[model samples]
Target: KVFGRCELAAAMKRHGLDNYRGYSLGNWVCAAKFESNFNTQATNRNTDGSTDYGILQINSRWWCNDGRTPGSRNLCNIPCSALLSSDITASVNCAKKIVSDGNGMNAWVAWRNRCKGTDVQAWIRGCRL
Candidate 1:
């Protein structure tokens, strides 16, 4: 099952992704909420036939191999299906590299469209962390 917002926050917090780069946990939570709604199995098809996989929506073009897509850089060194696990470890690690590559959360169209410049403080509203 996809995690509820609070449960997702707790798991992510437990996994120590409260922040990556200068972005806040709120931003990460917000990005996931919009990117894939905290569903680890999520996938989205790009117009060019590339695929985005996992909660942070790492692209097959750079992060992982769904195997159908040719020329994947496979930067995370794991199959793209690994990202779809209910356990988020691989996805989180790959996201760290993605952020460092300079896209930050902007790599997710969700963040650019919905989360950017919004009152992100609300995402952590009920979390004890």
Candidate 2:
């Protein structure tokens, strides 16, 4: 596992997901499976023939030109790249921010449900971490 139990726990906590109500590692793993087959280095081609890089398939152009000030020119500052890199914790924290600072937990819940299955909701309900 690229992430240990403690590391995963910390990542979840940073995103205010410590309760796991509708988000869990299983959900994340499921999303990763469909999105990039768990490949943190995955990339995809766009309609414009450009590339969306990293495991989460982040689009460099969108992040760069969005005027979000990614904090650095490195991929870690970009949403997609950061979500798939070693600095994934930073990406998750940023995702929480972009999702309306905890008001958008439903987005994560929706992503988990869409990519995994509605049945996965049961696994998240009482998950320990």
Candidate 3:
């Protein structure tokens, strides 16, 4: 709801995500597409009894808290609902910390599965990133 591809790129660019943690706009945008289709409210029930929240599919077991599901390390220090809103700063910040945990963007399985080695120019084709 917050953004399509172009606006997502601009938001990311504003946050200096155009090239952060050695991942490009292409990789980031592509991951967003595959993970949540850029829908902030997107969520998925994982096979591990965990839920993935928000655009990045941040797991309930790690970054955020879901009702009845106690999370482990709250690396984001923000509520899971925060990632479901149109505002993405909190989500992006969490993602930054996650990648900085030394795994880079590889921390996102969606990125590894879909964005890796793919031509992602169209993700930001007309965006001024």
Candidate 4:
């Protein structure tokens, strides 16, 4: 499932990504836009052979266990498959873990390159969240 901007903003805010770990709602929205274009089934293989899954692009090497990535951290304690679901609950919960693990939104390179230290309010301007 792909989400519209305000649609995704409402979902993220409902799931507590708003001001989560000092990352604003706009920041989360921007990262997800760049990460997967709000695609629920998005997946990308990394140079290290690990894969990123779902909208947040959580990596299999450190967050979700894909069963293919060697030495998987499985920090989210969930199979990577769950991250691809349209519900996004697992994805959002796991994202909290990723941030709480001290990575903040920096866990996503896309976020660091695009959302960090930038004016992201436009990402959530019409969300009414």
Candidate number of the best TM-score: 4
| lDDT score, candidate 2 | 0.47
Q: Work out how many backbone clashes candidate 3 has.
A: 0
Model 2, stretches more than 4 Å misplaced?
1-27, 64-84, 101-117, 122-128
Candidate 3 lDDT: 0.82
Model 1: per-residue lDDT, tens digit, 9-128? 887788777766888888888989999988888999998778999888888888898887777689999999998998888988888888888767788789999999999879989888
Best to worst by TM-score, what's the order?
Answer: 4, 1, 3, 2
lDDT of 4 by residue, 41-128 (tens): 9999999999999999999999989889997799899999999998999999999988888767888999999988889998988667
State how far residue 52 of model 4 sits from its true place (Å).
Answer: 0.2
* Candidate 3: residue pairs that collide: none
* Shift of residue 11 alpha carbon in model 1, Å: 1.8
Q: Candidate 1 versus the native: TM-score?
A: 0.94
lDDT string, candidate 2, 28-118, tens digits: 5444445455455666755654455543344444332223333323333544545557655554554444344354434333354565445
Whole-model lDDT for model 4 versus the true structure? 0.92
C-alpha lDDT values of all predictions: 0.85, 0.47, 0.82, 0.92
Assess every candidate by TM-score: 0.94, 0.48, 0.91, 0.96
